[model samples]
Target: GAALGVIAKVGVDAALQQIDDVWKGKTVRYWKCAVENRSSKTLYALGTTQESGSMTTVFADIPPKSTGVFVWEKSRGAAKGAVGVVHYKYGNKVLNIMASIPYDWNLYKAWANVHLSDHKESFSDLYKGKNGAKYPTRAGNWGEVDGTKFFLTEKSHAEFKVIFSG
Candidate 1:
């Protein structure tokens, strides 16, 4: 199959989270939702390999008595004692869940990075070669069917689906 860009939206509007719980550099339980509050938001690739990919901070305005499916990465940054970004990527940045990510990350419990894309686009590593060498990928196969032409379609979110890491 082919790999397309992955988009992501965070927050549940006026939503508050337990300030204590954090990922702390461990494998997180990540999830994705298609829509929230009747609003559909998606993440798009930011910049090129040479330049930092385009990254936009988005938060959802979840209404009262209403909740939409949610897609979450690390609500917080890398685990506390994480070693060398066990799953390193382009952005070696970390968010203090105890603190809060740029955008409003709502009541997210914990999530593991489950590569939901059939494209296997979640390979984690560095790009020592070119400006934007994507992490090792299963894209070649994913690309074939999806007709997704890009090798690295970072930060862009598709529809919502449940993916778990075993």
Candidate 2:
């Protein structure tokens, strides 16, 4: 539903399972929530469980250019698999992302994916899928997308980078 004030959810079961089944024993980096609302409306940040109800007053007001950082909940900070869903709101435009830890079964490359620019572009634009093009950095290395100053590790499994640019 794209109706105004709408919200979405991401489950942790599959994500948790992947972390246990494939990424066991390895250390996947801990993730902190970062919200960058490029849109003009006032964006409110909500987690999965919170979205279930509430006409409640919000806390995370991601106004234009204001980035919100969500810290891990103690025990959740050090685990390889963090389970939770993040929600973003701005009028009728809402987005949800899993803070779940994911990984490849064979290579054991673990990663998480987040959509920051609503435009669906990321470092992926400069260094993924499209061939015959020069990559943002070395053929296989780290880089920042559009000069954001955040480092992005190379694309594994074609386009998914184990070290994502959040």
Candidate 3:
């Protein structure tokens, strides 16, 4: 079976979230999305959204630990929306993380999506010894078939199907 591609749309317009959220007006809840690199290597990646669009911020090869100063639209609203994944790579390591920006209103409570992923290996990592092809992946696999090709076609290691709010 093919892996369902991992994708996220953050920063839905405040007005749009309202129409979709039957509980938008009633809920006083939110989940501020963020990420941290707990590994020693530098993390190079992209942060994308519906409102702000796409931008790349190399997780500043600072040290053994770091948290992105910029957040996934972590804020309050008379409404709500979404942030997105830190689609990234480190020395042929490819991974994706979708933050919980989905909002809800309940009589007493609601839920937020909170999950990262294991350090899944990719095909590009195989040719690390080759001189010219040392770095096969140059960008986060956005809008490309490379991720699917590597994870599904060649390796058959299904890409995780990560979902957030409706």
Those runs of model 2 whose alpha carbons end farther than 4 Å from true positions after fitting are: 1-29, 49-59, 73-80, 102-108, 114-166
Which candidate has the highest lDDT of all? 2
Error of 3 at 113 (Å): 6.6
Off by over 4 Å in 1: 1-11, 17-120, 123-166
**Candidate 1: count of backbone clashes, pairs at least 3 residues apart or interchain:** 33
Steric overlap count per candidate: 33, 0, 0
Question: Model 3 over residues 1-166: C-alpha lDDT tens digits?
Answer: 0011111222222212222222122223222222334455655553343321212222322122433323233233434433333455555654444323233323212111222234532222322312222223221232112222211111111111222110
Best by the TM-score measure: 2
Once fitted onto the true fold, the runs of candidate 3 whose alpha carbons sit more than 4 angstroms away are 1-34, 49-63, 74-78, 107-166
| TM-scores, each model vs. reference | 0.17, 0.39, 0.34
RMSD for all candidates, in order, please.
16.5, 13.1, 16.7
Candidate 2, residues 74-135: lDDT per residue as tens digits?
A: 13234323333355554654443332222332443333333334422232332332322123
lDDT of candidate model 3 versus the reference? 0.28
Distance from true location, Cα of 40 in model 2, Å: 0.8
Candidate 2: worst 10 consecutive residues by lDDT? 1-10
